[PDB]
Design a binder for this molecule. Structure first.
Ligand SMILES: Nc1ncnc2c1ncn2[C@@H]1O[C@H](COP(=O)(O)O)[C@@H](O)[C@H]1O
Ligand SMILES: [Cl-]
Ligand SMILES: [Cl-]
Lengths: 150, 151
């Protein structure tokens, strides 16, 4: 449980360390106090143990599980391919695509913690409670996850 | 009345090989029957995942972290990927058949598990069960065998 939180952080760090330098797009949302049941209902059920390796395999481009969001519930990957509400806010830079607007939209509609890897640039970003943090370093991503989840 | 576990299993396997065979994506999938596969499951990466054709496909995409080794199904879950199975020590195995096939055949000597393979060389779908090896099944043949065995 404390060790489960450290495995969660390590899984996310391994996945983003693989995907970011390969510019593999990724979108991962973690449930907090507000249920994500309605978005989980839109995805393919996995109910899978969390590991960096499984997160990488999910997001490999042009594969059946890659398109849409992974939603983490507790210590399980609940689903992949979930459809998240887009943000209609105009303050979103033009260069930020669908994945980023999906993450931002969920962070305006829930207290879920979402991170993105850009398929255009490999930039790592976080969307949480209406704040959007662009282009984190891997070390910064890790310490932010640790502070939030450990 | 929703689709039974057995119907979902058959559909998952059929969808997966239907995708991997034409693409010549190698695959190795073993299903536990009455004899526990616990010692082989211990060698794999824990997934404990719901069975879907989509997940099986994503596991075996070439040059990915989960694609090497065997997937082992236990009950209605994908227990592990990347598992090690016993390689067949037999010498009456054609030189056409590589290590995935020898692993499938080996496990079918050591247990009553049902294993199927997709060849990365030809895309051929094959089954290894109770020491017998059935090469190059059609998709229809594969499905009917799965139904006769699992339903
Ligand atoms: N003992 C084994 N059990 C399960 N899979 C294996 C085993 N040995 C090799 N493989 C896999 O068989 C495939 C072909 O092996 P190779 O011909 O050595 O490239 C690769 O995915 C290997 O990881
Ligand atoms: Cl980003
Ligand atoms: Cl930073």
């Amino acid at each position: 449980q404390l060790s489960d939180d450290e495995k969660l952080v390590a899984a996310f760090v391994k996945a983003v360390a693989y995907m970011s330098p390969r510019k593999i797009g990724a979108l991962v949302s973690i449930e907090e106090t507000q249920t994500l049941r309605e978005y989980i209902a839109t995805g393919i059920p996995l109910d899978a143990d969390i590991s960096g390796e499984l997160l990488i395999n999910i997001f490999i481009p042009n594969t059946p599980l890659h398109d849409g969001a992974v939603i983490v519930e507790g210590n399980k990957i609940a689903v992949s391919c979930a459809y998240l509400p887009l943000s209609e806010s105009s303050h979103i830079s033009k260069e930020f695509g669908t994945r980023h607007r999906a993450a931002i939209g969920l962070s305006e509609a829930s207290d879920a913690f979402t991170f993105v890897v850009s398929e255009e640039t490999g930039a790592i970003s976080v969307a949480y409670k209406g704040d959007f943090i662009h282009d984190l370093s891997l070390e910064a991503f890790e310490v932010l996850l640790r502070e939030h989840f450990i």
